[PDB]
Amino acid sequence: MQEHYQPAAIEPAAQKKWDDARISNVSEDASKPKYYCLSMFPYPSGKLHMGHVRNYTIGDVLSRFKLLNGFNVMQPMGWDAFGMPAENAAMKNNVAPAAWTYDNIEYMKTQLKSLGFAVDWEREVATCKPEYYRWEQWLFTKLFEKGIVYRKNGTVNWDPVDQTVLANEQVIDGRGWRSGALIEKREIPMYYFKITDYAEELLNDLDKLEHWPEQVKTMQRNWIGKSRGMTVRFAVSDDSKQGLEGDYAKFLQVYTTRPDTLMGATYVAVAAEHPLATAAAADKPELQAFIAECKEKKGVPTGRYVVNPLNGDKLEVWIANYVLWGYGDGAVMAVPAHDERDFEFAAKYNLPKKQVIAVGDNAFDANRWQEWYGDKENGVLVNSGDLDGLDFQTAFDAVAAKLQSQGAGEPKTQYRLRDWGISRQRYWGCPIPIVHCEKCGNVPVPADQLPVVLPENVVPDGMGSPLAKMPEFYETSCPCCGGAAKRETDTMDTFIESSWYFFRYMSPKFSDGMVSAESAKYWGAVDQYIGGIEHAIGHLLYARFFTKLMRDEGLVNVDEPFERLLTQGMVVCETYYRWINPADVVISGTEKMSKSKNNGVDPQELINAYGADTARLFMMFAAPPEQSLEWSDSGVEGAHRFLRRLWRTVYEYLKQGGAVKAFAGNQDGLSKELKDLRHKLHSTTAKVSDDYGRRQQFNTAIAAVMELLNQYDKTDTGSEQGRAVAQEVLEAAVRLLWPIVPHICETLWSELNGAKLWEAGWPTVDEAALVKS
Ligand SMILES: CC(C)C[C@H](N)C(=O)OP(=O)(O)OC[C@H]1O[C@@H](n2cnc3c(N)ncnc32)[C@H](O)[C@@H]1O
Ligand SMILES: [Mg+2]
Ligand SMILES: [Zn+2]
């Protein structure tokens, strides 16, 4: 054993030792229990930095920990090759997207292999490969027939810089997720995933996720935005029916979020395009000027009356400029006494305010709005008949049974979740398998003729969809009739491949479907998922929706894709722009380590200067995995000094007697200072085993091993029994730190014990060494 700690010699040799052993290339071995640990797979938008290194190290620490405990661990690594992240980097460097992606894929693969992660590289996947995106094309066509995927025109978010439409989850604070430019609204036909059909299921199965951060679960609940309301039909008075015809001659439908205020409704609003408005304006030019006005808050009365179905009040129908047509049934009711917007609309034209809700005993001010009138949590009913005294949860249920008895209403549920538009006017993306025929229409591509191969030899000029300028691509024959037809030149979003890549890892070479029904049953769901919280509304929701699709198609049998979720904290560093890199202007301050700010420390520059063990140790020790981590060079130096201490500790031990048999069995006869050291040992083994697999607190697990070494240095171990205890302390330490730093621990383990480390396994707690003296 050399006296100096040389990472340049111990790390490549240990990586080859692991590669030759093939301890990460796992199959469906039924002997061991499975453990699917997954880290969010990166965008090939350039070189990885230490921020990604923390993400993938946190996953490696968990994967190596379970592996040491006799687990069949699958830690796979892939490349999120399609979409804007890679294509924008290709255009920024003036390179074809296919070339820039593949060359950066092979650089990022060598970046991760230098860090020595326990990755099953035989399961490596590139989303841009046709052997991959053919199956999301397959699922696209099968869902298109079922109507779950549909094409429709409408109002969409438009990115002027990225020159493409965006989904609602890709619009961050009214700006684009990749561009930051302000989003515009356009009328463009798109392909949508009917994610609203799964809105209720995506909301209830959230409670199943007991091992998800409650922040991620809460953000999804607000994004779905479920609200329970009431659809109320107001019978038009027999005199006010003159003019209307159809359903609008019988009743007028409204939706209200607070239907406990039904009796307190003093009037009713309507839209300008509503037939009840145009019929009342056929003889009134004062309303034909309002109908033509909007087509603030203004309103005109038309003498039309509807019947409040719960008390019989004859509420007049007002034409308002705030009732948007097409949204809902194009009409609402008005309760000014318990609605701020209706209080302003009624204090504007002097309309009644029959109070119906009390909050404890706050004196009701008639013409003074107060925040207690919208209290849907601490309110009973007044002046409502058989509703007086019922809370909102009871007043809702009583009004529902009341309206259903007359047939003038029923409860209705609404979500703020809109359908998922996936059409993109970009080149680098999965082609949409739809062929437009003038005779047949939008027909899907036959499954035998999949994939619709995206030509890789394209360099976008930067002015419009490049696929719409390639006749040799979009000119084809109709698969239904055989005539002239055009291919769909729009491509899918990058969040389509990332919504099922965790299943493709189970069978990356399977040529008959998305995932083999055999391996899908063996791996089940992802046991541990690690990735940034920025995907709580986008990817982490898209993945759950795609899983419920693939399940309802018969390809997988689980409901949720990820059991546990760990949103690791962001690594931060000072930034400079004019963007300038620290190792090479203005001072932007401490910011997230990102390529879009050029404050990223390259992992390869650190391994060349300190080694992979030093970089991984600094990431795991500087802070808990969920906490933000500030980059510190002294933190890098201190982590290296400890790895020197661990190396020098084993050297001086071996240089003073050589390897002996580690102490085991009954410890009576041992001295107190050695009984105390074995006590600290097995307290550390239990503390580390608990900080890894329960608390997931790696920094305090490293600190616990350091305290064990502090007591080892303070304990005299030169005797015959001291060496045996000293052999036990070091055999435990190099196995406890192995998930954090496997290169140095594998080297020191073989210098202490001839056996293979992973067959020695995780250190056990000798509880006899824990009892006090
Ligand atoms: C499933 C897919 C939609 C994932 C998508 N391809 C993606 O986000 O990929 P991207 O290549 O952007 O990053 C890969 C991973 O690295 C994390 N990450 C990035 N910067 C930092 C940082 N400063 N500190 C800590 N962690 C960081 C980031 O949260 C992500 O889990
Ligand atoms: Mg459960
Ligand atoms: Zn046809």
Curated annotation (Swiss-Prot):
Keywords, sorted A to Z: Aminoacyl-tRNA synthetase, ATP-binding, Cytoplasm, Ligase, Nucleotide-binding, Protein biosynthesis
Motif 'HIGH' region location, chain numbering: 42-52
Entry annotated with the keyword tRNA processing: no
Gene3D superfamilies associated with the record: 2.20.28.290, 3.10.20.590, HUPs, Isoleucyl-tRNA Synthetase, Domain 1, Valyl/Leucyl/Isoleucyl-tRNA synthetase, editing domain
Motif 'KMSKS' region: chain residues: 592-596
Signal sequence extent: none
Protein's recorded name: Leucine--tRNA ligase
Originating species: Neisseria gonorrhoeae (strain NCCP11945)
Subcellular location: Cytoplasm
One biological process term in Gene Ontology: leucyl-tRNA aminoacylation
Main location: cytoplasm
GO CC aspect terms: cytosol
Pfam families linked: Anticodon_1, tRNA-synt_1, tRNA-synt_1_2, tRNA-synt_1g
EC number, UniProt record: 6.1.1.4
InterPro entries: aa-tRNA-synth_I_CS (IPR001412), aa-tRNA-synth_Ia (IPR002300), Leu-tRNA-ligase (IPR002302), Leu_tRNA-synth_edit (IPR025709), M/V/L/I-tRNA-synth_anticd-bd (IPR013155), Methionyl/Leucyl_tRNA_Synth (IPR015413), Rossmann-like_a/b/a_fold (IPR014729), tRNAsynth_Ia_anticodon-bd (IPR009080)
MF GO annotations: aminoacyl-tRNA deacylase activity; ATP binding; leucine-tRNA ligase activity
Catalytic reaction annotation: tRNA(Leu) + L-leucine + ATP = L-leucyl-tRNA(Leu) + AMP + diphosphate
Chain residues that bind ATP: 595
